[PDB]
Amino acid sequence: EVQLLESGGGLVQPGGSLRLSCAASGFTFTHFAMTWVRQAPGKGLEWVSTIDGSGGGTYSADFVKGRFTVSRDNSKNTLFLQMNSLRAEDTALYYCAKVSPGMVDDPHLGGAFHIWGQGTMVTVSS
Amino acid sequence: GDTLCIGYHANNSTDTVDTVLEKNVTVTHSVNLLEDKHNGKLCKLRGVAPLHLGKCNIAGWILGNPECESLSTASSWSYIVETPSSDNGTCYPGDFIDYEELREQLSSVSSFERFEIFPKTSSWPNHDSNKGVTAACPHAGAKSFYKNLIWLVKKGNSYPKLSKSYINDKGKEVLVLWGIHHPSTSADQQSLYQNADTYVFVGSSRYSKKFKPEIAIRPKVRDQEGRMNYYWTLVEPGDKITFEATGNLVVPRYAFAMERNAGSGIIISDTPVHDCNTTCQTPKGAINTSLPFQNIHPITIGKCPKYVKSTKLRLATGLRNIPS
Amino acid sequence: GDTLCIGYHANNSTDTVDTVLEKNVTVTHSVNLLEDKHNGKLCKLRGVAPLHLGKCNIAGWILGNPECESLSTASSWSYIVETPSSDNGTCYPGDFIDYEELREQLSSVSSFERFEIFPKTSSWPNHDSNKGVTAACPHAGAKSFYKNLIWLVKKGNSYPKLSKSYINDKGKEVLVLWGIHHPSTSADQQSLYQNADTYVFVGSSRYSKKFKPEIAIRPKVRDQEGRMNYYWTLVEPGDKITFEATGNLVVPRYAFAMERNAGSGIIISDTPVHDCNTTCQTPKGAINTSLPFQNIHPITIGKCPKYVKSTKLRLATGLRNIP
Amino acid sequence: DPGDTLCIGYHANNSTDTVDTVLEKNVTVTHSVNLLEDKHNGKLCKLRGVAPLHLGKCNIAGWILGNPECESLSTASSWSYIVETPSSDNGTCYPGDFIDYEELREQLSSVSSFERFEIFPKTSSWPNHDSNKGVTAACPHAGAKSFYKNLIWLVKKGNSYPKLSKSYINDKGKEVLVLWGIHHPSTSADQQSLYQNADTYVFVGSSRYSKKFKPEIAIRPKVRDQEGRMNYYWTLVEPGDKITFEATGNLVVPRYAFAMERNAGSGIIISDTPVHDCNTTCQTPKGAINTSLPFQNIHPITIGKCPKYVKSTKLRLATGLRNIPS
Amino acid sequence: SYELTQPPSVSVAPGQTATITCGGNNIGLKTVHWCQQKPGQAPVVVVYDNNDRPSGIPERFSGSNSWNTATLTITGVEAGDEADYYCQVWDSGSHQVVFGGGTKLTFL
Amino acid sequence: GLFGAIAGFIEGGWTGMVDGWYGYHHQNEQGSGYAADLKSTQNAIDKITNKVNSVIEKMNTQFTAVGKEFNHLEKRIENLNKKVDDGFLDIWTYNAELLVLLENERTLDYHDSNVKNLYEKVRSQLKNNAKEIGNGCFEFYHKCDNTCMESVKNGTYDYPKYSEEAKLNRE
Amino acid sequence: GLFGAIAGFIEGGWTGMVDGWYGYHHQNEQGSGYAADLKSTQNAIDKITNKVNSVIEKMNTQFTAVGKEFNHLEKRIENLNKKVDDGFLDIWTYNAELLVLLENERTLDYHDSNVKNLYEKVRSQLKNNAKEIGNGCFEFYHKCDNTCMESVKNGTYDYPKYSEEAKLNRE
Amino acid sequence: GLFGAIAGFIEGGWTGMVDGWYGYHHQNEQGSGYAADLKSTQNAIDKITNKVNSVIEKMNTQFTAVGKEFNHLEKRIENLNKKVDDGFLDIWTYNAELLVLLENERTLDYHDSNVKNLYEKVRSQLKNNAKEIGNGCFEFYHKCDNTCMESVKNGTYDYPKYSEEAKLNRE
Ligand SMILES: *[C@@H]1O[C@H](CO)[C@@H](O)[C@H](O)[C@H]1NC(C)=O
Ligand SMILES: *[C@@H]1O[C@H](CO)[C@@H](O)[C@H](O)[C@H]1NC(C)=O
Ligand SMILES: *[C@@H]1O[C@H](CO)[C@@H](O)[C@H](O)[C@H]1NC(C)=O
Ligand SMILES: *[C@@H]1O[C@H](CO)[C@@H](O)[C@H](O)[C@H]1NC(C)=O
Ligand SMILES: *[C@@H]1O[C@H](CO)[C@@H](O)[C@H](O)[C@H]1NC(C)=O
Ligand SMILES: *[C@@H]1O[C@H](CO)[C@@H](O)[C@H](O)[C@H]1NC(C)=O
Ligand SMILES: *[C@@H]1O[C@H](CO)[C@@H](O)[C@H](O)[C@H]1NC(C)=O
Ligand SMILES: *[C@@H]1O[C@H](CO)[C@@H](O)[C@H](O)[C@H]1NC(C)=O
Ligand SMILES: *[C@@H]1O[C@H](CO)[C@@H](O)[C@H](O)[C@H]1NC(C)=O
Ligand SMILES: *[C@@H]1O[C@H](CO)[C@@H](O)[C@H](O)[C@H]1NC(C)=O
Ligand SMILES: *[C@@H]1O[C@H](CO)[C@@H](O)[C@H](O)[C@H]1NC(C)=O
Ligand SMILES: *[C@@H]1O[C@H](CO)[C@@H](O)[C@H](O)[C@H]1NC(C)=O
Ligand SMILES: *[C@@H]1O[C@H](CO)[C@@H](O)[C@H](O)[C@H]1NC(C)=O
Ligand SMILES: *[C@@H]1O[C@H](CO)[C@@H](O)[C@H](O)[C@H]1NC(C)=O
C-alpha cells in the first residue's frame, strides 16, 4: 500500500542546517506530485513546498524567502528537502503528503492529500 | 363658349421620385419598393419559434454550457439568435474544429429532440465521471462543466481502453460531439489519463480520424494553460459510431437527434424576441413585405427582398403633381 | 369613294407575350428566347466524344474498378457521364482524399493515355503483387482488386523499404495515384506489412506528405472493417516523384499521361449517349440552340444559355394580333 | 421670299463618333461620352495618396521571409498594392511549402502601419543556440552562402539542442505577425547532425492558435540543389496576448516580427509595369485608370473603387442627337 | 494574497446538524479538500472535492462549495466528530497551498 | 415630356377632382365641375398596377440565408463571400435605382401618352367643331349641353347633327 | 398604346394580307385588295430582327461548367456556391423577365409608332385632300386612279395636280 | 424614329449652327442665319447630362480587391471564383451593352421628342397662319419681321394681330 515515510532533524541552532526526506513506497512514485506541510504544536496547518512529479517546476510558500528548496529524486523513489536553518520560528512536526490526481484543473498539483505522512519533530531555537 | 379641358389631377402630396431626365419631381401617388421600416423584434419565421440562446453561442448551447440552461429547445426553429455580447460559449480554452459549418448545418432543424445516447448512470462503468468539472465553467460559484459531455478521468490508477458504440436506430441524423483534452504538461497528461500516449479513434461508416494530445504549455486563457479541442460528426440513420480511446476523450452524455430542413443562418443581434408572423427576418428587425427591395441589413434569412444602398426607390404610379 | 386605309397585319397565330403593362396579349409573330426542347441524348461537345463510365463513377474508373472496365477509354472528352444509380466506385471502404477537386481537374483532357508507370511484371521485385486481392471488389464471383493499382503485401516474411521513382519524360502532367491502407487491428498490420510503424512518403517538386496508418476496429462497410484512403498528385513535365514506404502502400500500376484543357464539369444522368454535335449539354438533354435563356436544368456545361425560372420568355417580333 | 420660313432642324457637324442602338447598329452622333475608358497611364501609381509597395525581383514569400535578393527595396509604412514582376522567381529560396500562403498574401495587403521590429534580438535572445552557422546555398548573396534576414535558422550549439523557450508579450497595441519555419531534413543523419534530438516537436502557442509540428524526414527529388523541405508557418499575435515558442528541434525562429494594423480590402498586382508617383482611383496590372466612368475594359483584375470590367469595345453613350450632315 | 478564514470554534448539540465553514475569497472556482485532525493524528480527508466522499468514511460527512465559503455540512454530529477541521485549497493564481486555522468544534 | 402632355399644352394639375388620374372640365350653361373619364382611368390604373405587380412579383425568390460566417484562416473565402455580396449589391443597386429612374420616366411617359391620346381622341371626335386653344381646352362653336358632354366623354360623337350649327357659328 | 395607332383609332388587324407587317387597303374603281409597303416593312423587320440579334448576340457566354461538387464537410462552401447560383438565377430571371416585359412593350410601341408614322406620312402627302374618318382609313376627294394609289404608297404625291379636283369637292 | 422628326419629316441636320443641339433658321427680308433657343437646348442638355450622371454616379462601387489567388489543391474554389468573376462579367457586359443599346435608342428618341415638340409648339403658336411646307419648315402667309421671329422662338406669339394679314394673303 501507499506508505509515505519521514526523516528529519532533532535540534539545530539558527545558523545551521539539517536534512528532510520523504521515502515514499508502495506506488508509482514518478507520477504523483509530493508536498511538505508542517504545523506548530497547537496551531493550524501551514504549507511548506510542493514539487512536480517530473522533478522540474517547484513551488514553495512565502515564509521561506528563498531559503527552503524542495528537490525531487525519481530514481530512488525518495523526496528531499532543504532545511538551511536561519530562523528560530521553524518549530513544527514535518509531514510529507502525496497529491492524488486532481479534477480537470491543476491535476498533478491541486489534488487531495489522501495519503498523509507522519510527523518528525524539527525544533530550532538558541 | 363652353369648355371641355382635358387635364390631370393634382393634390397636396409631396412624395418625390427621380427619373433619368429630371430628379426631385413630385408625384400624386407612389409606391415604395424600398422597405425602410422594420418591427424591431426577432419574431417567428415560417410558422415555428426561432431559437434564442441568450447569453450563449452555438459552441455553448450544443456543448451544454452551464450558462445555457435558461434556453429551451423543444421543436423546429428557423434560425439561431445570439447576442453580440454572447461570450458564454466554450468556457474551456480551445478551438472548436469545423465550427462555422456546424453552425450552418444546425441553423435550422426540423426535428430536434435532445436525447441521451449514453446515460451517465450506467454507460461508463470503469471510468470516473464525477471528477470532470472545471473552475473555468462556473454555473453558480462552484465548479461545473458541460451537461451534454462527460470529461473522463482514470478511475483509481488506470484508464482502460474505452470501446462503446451507438447503433443509430431513430431514422434521423444523430449529431454527436466529443472532446479531446490537450494537457499543458505531461504530468497532467498522466495524472488524468494513465496512458502516456493516448489515441482517440472515432469511427463511423463514413467518418474516421485518430486523435492525439499536443502536450505543451500555452499562454493562460480563462486561467487555463491547456486546450480542449472539440470534434463532431453526423451519424447516418442506420450506421454505427464507434468510440475508442485510451485517454483524453470527452464522451457525449447527450447527443442530438437531428433532421436538417433546407438550411438557414445565424442572426446575431440585441433585439428582443416576440411572437409575430414574418416572412423575412433581419438582425435589426423583422419585415413582412412582398416589396422587392430593402435597405435594413445585408445579412437576411428567409424569402427576403434584395439589400440595396439606395434611399429613394419609389415607382411614380401617379402623374407629375404640379398643383395650381 | 376610294381609300388608302392604313392597317396592320393579323393572322390566326395564338402566341402570347407578356408586356409590363398588359399580360397575355396575342402577337402575330414571336421569337422564343426560352427553349424547352432537349434532344434527351448525351451527345458530343466541341466535336469530341464524351466519356461514359456507365455503372461506375470517377473514383472507380480512375482507380481501375473491375466492374467498369467494359468502357473503351478514349484520348479526349468534354465531360464525364455518371448514372445517378452508379455506385460501383471505391469498392474497398475509405475516404478518397482530395476527391472532388480531382474530379474537377479530370473533367476534360486533351490527351489521356493510360500507361504502365511501373509495370507489374518487373517494377516490384521484392514485394508480393498477386496476394493483394479483396472481396470488396469481386469479379466473376472471385476475389480481385483494382487494375490501375497494386495492393502490395510483404513477400515472404518481410516488407523492404520500397524505393521507386518516376522521372516524368512525356512532356505532360502524369497523374499518379496511390492508396494507403489502414488495417483493423495490429495483427492485420503485422500479417500484411510486417512493421508496426510504417511511413509512406510521396515526394515531388511541389508535393510532400508523410502518411501513417490509423489502426483501429471500425464499423463494417461492405464486409470490411478497414479503410483505404486514396491520394494523388500531378507530376509536372520533367519533374520527379519518389515513392518511399515501409508498408501500407498501394502502388500505381497504371498512371495516366494527362494534359488539361480549361476545365469542365461532370454530368450525372440516366440519359443514353448518342452521336450528335451540340454546343450545350445538361443532364436532362443536350441543348442545340442559339437562344440566350434556358429552363431545362441549372447544371450546364459548354457555351450554354443562362438558366432562369421562367416559362414564357416569348419575345414579341410581330404586331398586336387583333383578328 | 414669298414666305419667311422658320425651319426647325437639328445640329449636325463633322463627327465620326458611332454608337450602337437596339434598332440600327452604326449611327453617327454629334456628341457622345465614352463610358468604356480604354486608356491606362502605364505606371503603377498611388491609391489614397499612398505609395504602392514594390518588391521588384521578389515575391511576398521572399519579402516577408527576408530574402537577400530583394533587400534593396525601401520598406514603407502603408501601401494598397504589392507589386511583383511576372517572373518574381527570387522568393522562397529553400524548397518548401509556405503553409497558408495565399491567406497571408491576402492579409498583409493594405497595411496601415508596417514597422518591422526585431522581436527577438540576434545579439542576445538566443544564448544557447548557434545562429551564425545557419547559412545555405539556396540563398546565395554576393556569391557566398547566406540565409533569410527576418528569420534565424537555429542549429545545435556544441553537441546538444536545448529545449527552446521564448515568449513575446505583445505590447504594441496592434497585431504582430510572427513567421517561423520548420525544417524537414532529407536524411535522419541530417536531422541528428543539425538538431541533436531525433524525436523533435515544435509547438507555437498564441493563446488562440495551437499546433504541434513534427519532421517529415525522407529523401526528396532535388529542388535548387536541396533534398529537404522547409515549411513556413505564421500567426497573428493579438494586441494583448502572448506567443510561446517551445521547440526541442527543427525551428527557424523569427529574427523580425512585423507590427501591423490592417485596413483590409486590397490585393496583389503582378506586372512589369514601372512604378512612378501618380494620384489615381484605380490601378490594374496593365496600367492605372483616372476616370469617373462606369465601365472599363483594361484588365479583369482591378484593385480599388474603380469601374466594372466588361468585354465590350464600344460603350459609347450618345449624349448628342443623330448626326446626318448634308 | 489568497486568504482563508474560519470560525475558531463552532457550537453544536449532539445529534444536531453541524456546519463547518471555510470562508474567504471566491472559493467556488477552486477545489476544497476537507480534512479533520484528531489530537495525535494526521489529516484524514472527508470530502476530497466540491462534493464527493472517500470510501471507509461515513456518509454523514458532506461538502458543498459555494460563492465565497466552503461548508463541510455534517448531517448529524456524534462523539467522534470533535476535532480541528482544516480546509486545503490549491491557489491557481499564485501557485500555493493554503490551509486554515480550522474549527475546533465541540458537540458539548 | 416625350409626348408633350404633362407640362406641354397643359401645365397645371387640377386639385378639384379626386375621382381619377385623368379628368375633364365641363363649363356649359347647365352646370360645371370636374369629372374623371371612367374607362381611361380604369384601364390606365389597371395597367399601372400591373406594372407595379410585374416589378414586385417577377422578383420572386427562394429561401436563402444571405449571411455566411468564416474564421480567420479562411480570409480569401471570406473576401470571396464579401465580393459576392458586394457584387450582388452593385448589380441590384444599379438595376433597381437605375431601374427606378428608367421605370419612373416610362410611367410619367405613359401618363403623357394617356393624356395626349385622350386629347387626340377628343380632337378626332370633335374634328374642327372646337377651336383648339391648348391646355386641353376646346372652345365650343356650339351650345353643347350635358348630353353631348356625356357623349364626348363616352367616346361617341354625332358630328353631322352639330355640324351645321358649328358652321353657322364659325362664319 | 403609347402612340395610339394599334388598338387606338385603328382597332382591327387584317388577315387578308400576308405580304408585310404593315399595309394598305385600296377601294379604287380600278381594283381592290391589300398591298403592303415594301420599304417600311423591310426596315421594320430589319430593326426588329436586330433587336432579337442584339438580345441574343450581346449575351456572350464563354465555356463555364456551372456544376460544382462539394462534400458534406464543406457545407459552407456548398451554400456559398448555392447562393452564387441562386443570385445568378434571381438576377437572370428578374432581368430576363423584366427585359421581356419591356422589350415586348418597346416592340409593340415601335409597331405603334410605325403605324402612326405611316398615318402621319399619309396625311402629310395628301395634306387637306384626304379626310380622316378613324380606323386609319383615308377617304379621298378625287378619283385617284392606280397611278395615284402607287404615288401615295411610294411616298411622292403631287398635291397641286389634284388640288383643283379636290376643290370641286367640299363646294 | 419612334416620334418621327429626326430622319422623319426633318431629313437633314444643319452644319451652319453652333449654338445648340436644336435650333431654327429664318429667311426673312431683314436677315438670315441659324439661331438656337437657349431655353429648350439648355433644359434638354441639362436632362441629358443628368441622364449620363445617372448612369455614372448611381454606379457606386466599394474598395474591393477583385483579384483572388488560389493554389492547385483548391481548384473547385478557384473555378468558383472564376465562375463568380465570369458571371459578373456576363451580367455587367450584357447589362452594359443592352443599357447602351436601349438608353441610346431613348436618348435619340428624346432628341426626336424635342424636335417634334418644337415643331408642335411652332404649329400651336402659328395656327393656320403658317402652312406646313415640309422639311420641318413653316412657310408663312405674312411679312413676319425679326420681332415675330423672336416672339415665336420665345413662345409668345400673338395670333390675332397678324390674323388679318394672314387671311388676306391666304386667299
Ligand atoms: C390633403 O388633401 C386631402 C384630400 O382633400 C385631405 O384629406 C388632407 O387633409 C390634406 N392635407 C394633408 C396635409 O394631407
Ligand atoms: C431633393 O429634395 C430633398 C428634400 O429632402 C433634398 O434633400 C435634396 O438635396 C434634393 N435634391 C436635389 C438634387 O435638389
Ligand atoms: C460568462 O461571461 C461572463 C462575462 O464576461 C464571464 O465573467 C463568465 O466567466 C462567463 N462564464 C462562463 C461559464 O462562461
Ligand atoms: C401568423 O402568426 C400569428 C401570430 O403568431 C398566428 O396567430 C397565425 O395563426 C399565423 N398565421 C398563419 C397562416 O400561420
Ligand atoms: C404584417 O403583419 C400584420 C399583422 O401584425 C399584418 O396585418 C400586415 O398586413 C403585415 N404587413 C404587410 C405589409 O403585409
Ligand atoms: C393560318 O392560315 C394560314 C394561311 O393564311 C395557314 O397556312 C395556316 O395553317 C393557318 N394556321 C392554323 C393554325 O390554322
Ligand atoms: C457494384 O454495385 C452493386 C450494386 O449496384 C454491388 O452489389 C456490387 O457488390 C458492386 N461491386 C463492386 C466491385 O463494388
Ligand atoms: C458536328 O459533328 C458532326 C457529327 O456527325 C459532324 O459531321 C460535323 O462536321 C460537326 N460540325 C463541325 C462544325 O465540326
Ligand atoms: C442545331 O440547330 C440548328 C439551328 O436550328 C440546326 O441547323 C442544326 O441542324 C441543329 N443541329 C443538331 C445536331 O440538332
Ligand atoms: C470640322 O470643321 C471645322 C470647321 O470650322 C474645323 O474647325 C474642325 O476641325 C473640323 N473637324 C474635323 C474633325 O475635321
Ligand atoms: C459598322 O461599323 C463597323 C466599324 O466601322 C464596321 O466594321 C461594320 O461593318 C459596320 N456594320 C455592321 C453591320 O456592324
Ligand atoms: C534568384 O533568381 C536567379 C534567376 O533569376 C537564380 O539564379 C538565383 O539562384 C535566385 N536566388 C535566390 C536567392 O533565390
Ligand atoms: C494628388 O497627387 C498629385 C500628384 O503629385 C499631388 O499634386 C496632390 O497633392 C495629390 N493629392 C492628394 C495627396 O490629396
Ligand atoms: C485625373 O483626371 C482628372 C479629370 O478627370 C484631371 O483633372 C486630373 O488632373 C487627373 N489627374 C492625374 C494625376 O492624371
From TrEMBL, chain D:
The keyword Transmembrane helix applies. It is found in: Host apical cell membrane; Virion membrane. In natural infection, inactive HA is matured into HA1 and HA2 outside the cell by one or more trypsin-like, arginine-specific endoprotease secreted by the bronchial epithelial cells. One identified protease that may be involved in this process is secreted in lungs by club cells. GO terms for molecular function: host cell surface receptor binding. One of its GO terms (cellular component) is membrane. Disulfide bonds join C58-C70, C282-C306. The keyword Glycoprotein applies. It is a single-pass type I membrane protein. GO terms for biological process: clathrin-dependent endocytosis of virus by host cell; fusion of virus membrane with host endosome membrane; fusion of virus membrane with host plasma membrane; viral budding from plasma membrane; virion attachment to host cell. Keywords: Clathrin- and caveolin-independent endocytosis of virus by host, Clathrin-mediated endocytosis of virus by host, Disulfide bond, Fusion of virus membrane with host endosomal membrane, Fusion of virus membrane with host membrane, Glycoprotein, Hemagglutinin, Host cell membrane, Host membrane, Host-virus interaction, Lipoprotein, Membrane, Palmitate, Signal, Transmembrane, Transmembrane helix, Viral attachment to host cell, Viral envelope protein, Viral penetration into host cytoplasm, Virion, Virus endocytosis by host, Virus entry into host cell. It comes from the Viruses. Its main location: host cell. Belongs to the influenza viruses hemagglutinin family. Homotrimer of disulfide-linked HA1-HA2. Interacts with human CACNA1C. Binds to sialic acid-containing receptors on the cell surface, bringing about the attachment of the virus particle to the cell. This attachment induces virion internalization of about two third of the virus particles through clathrin-dependent endocytosis and about one third through a clathrin- and caveolin-independent pathway. Plays a major role in the determination of host range restriction and virulence. Class I viral fusion protein. Binds to sialic acid-containing receptors on the cell surface, bringing about the attachment of the virus particle to the cell. This attachment induces virion internalization either through clathrin-dependent endocytosis or through clathrin- and caveolin-independent pathway. Plays a major role in the determination of host range restriction and virulence. Class I viral fusion protein. Responsible for penetration of the virus into the cell cytoplasm by mediating the fusion of the membrane of the endocytosed virus particle with the endosomal membrane. This is Hemagglutinin. It comes from Influenza A virus. The gene is HA. The chain holds residues 18 to 340 of 566 of the full protein.
From TrEMBL, chains F, G, H:
Palmitoylated. It is found in: Host apical cell membrane; Virion membrane. Disulfide bonds join C144-C148. Binds to sialic acid-containing receptors on the cell surface, bringing about the attachment of the virus particle to the cell. This attachment induces virion internalization of about two third of the virus particles through clathrin-dependent endocytosis and about one third through a clathrin- and caveolin-independent pathway. Plays a major role in the determination of host range restriction and virulence. Class I viral fusion protein. Binds to sialic acid-containing receptors on the cell surface, bringing about the attachment of the virus particle to the cell. This attachment induces virion internalization either through clathrin-dependent endocytosis or through clathrin- and caveolin-independent pathway. Plays a major role in the determination of host range restriction and virulence. Class I viral fusion protein. Responsible for penetration of the virus into the cell cytoplasm by mediating the fusion of the membrane of the endocytosed virus particle with the endosomal membrane. Belongs to the influenza viruses hemagglutinin family. Homotrimer of disulfide-linked HA1-HA2. Interacts with human CACNA1C. This is Hemagglutinin. The chain holds residues 345 to 515 of 566 of the full protein.
